[PDB]
Design a protein around this ligand. Structure first.
Ligand SMILES: CNC(=O)c1ccccc1Nc1ncnc(Nc2cc(OC)c(OC)c(OC)c2)n1
Length: 259
């Protein structure tokens, strides 16, 4: 039973927003237990059964996954106003975190984040789930040594041209291999401490550059084998890209090498 009593939830400050309404941090309380920190998605004008159904489908999406590096569904409140209660990552967005902690994070930590995310994405691959929104903006920080894929509903779109595989841009095709492309971009962002890809470049010129063979450059202090793995994710032909299963394996070795 995923239904939660409203009085068990204490609403705190807003930590952002999505399509349906504001997102809040807060507390989930239960007798005999410590107060559990939670994120709370709200719906301005739920009830209206179409809108309420769409909003709640996002909870159902998260329900089917059980992984250490993907935010977990805690529960729902199906009465008005309708809330979805999620596991809180207390340190926020990965981009901000990397930008501020730049002189306090070593290379091992950054590779650790890439590795952790790859395990989440290999997990999704095995369930045949296509994310479509893999970007550093959608990764959350649970602890200095732990990151997680954020809510899938809240991850939705920015078309994220600068993150997208050519076949996704050209033919609206979205597969695990297009996800791999995006993950390659996400690793580059991590190594760059949260600098955005194709800075200063118009979206329309981006496809022209990829088609001309241009790729994002090797980040300073990124190890060669890791940049080599990144460029494989950016193979123009999707069938030449490694699967997340292979990425996990190779990121494991690269990480160990670095430690
Ligand atoms: C992919 N983005 C999300 O899932 C998301 C976006 C906006 C707000 C909350 C989101 N989801 C979420 N899920 C679990 N934990 C968190 N934690 C979190 C997220 C934050 O910013 C996105 C925070 O800074 C404002 C923050 O500081 C306390 C915590 N967010």
């Amino acid at each position: 039973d995923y239904e939660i009593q409203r009085e068990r939830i204490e609403l705190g400050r807003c930590i952002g927003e999505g399509q349906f309404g504001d997102v809040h941090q807060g507390i989930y309380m239960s007798p005999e237990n410590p107060a559990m920190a939670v994120a709370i998605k709200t719906c301005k004008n739920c009830t209206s059964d179409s809108v309420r159904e769409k909003f709640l489908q996002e909870a159902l999406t998260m329900r089917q996954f059980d992984h250490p590096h993907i935010v977990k569904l805690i529960g729902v409140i199906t009465e008005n106003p309708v809330w979805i209660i999620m596991e809180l990552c207390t340190l926020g967005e990965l981009r901000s975190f990397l930008q501020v902690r730049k002189f306090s994070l070593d290379l091992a930590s950054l590779i650790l984040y890439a590795y952790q995310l790859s395990t989440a994405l290999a997990y999704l691959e095995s369930k045949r789930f296509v994310h479509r929104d893999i970007a550093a903006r959608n990764v959350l920080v649970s602890a200095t040594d732990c990151v997680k894929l954020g809510d899938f509903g809240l991850s939705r779109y920015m078309l994220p041209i600068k993150w997208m595989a050519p076949e996704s841009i050209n033919f609206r095709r979205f597969t695990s291999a297009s996800d791999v492309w995006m993950f390659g971009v996400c690793m580059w962002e991590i190594l760059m401490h949260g600098v955005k890809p194709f800075q200063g470049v118009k979206n329309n010129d981006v496809i022209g550059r990829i088609e001309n063979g241009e790729r994002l450059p090797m980040p300073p202090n990124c190890p060669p084998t890791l940049y080599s793995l990144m460029t494989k994710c950016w193979a123009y032909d999707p069938s030449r890209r490694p699967r997340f299963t292979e990425l996990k394996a190779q990121l494991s070795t690269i990480l160990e090498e670095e430690k």
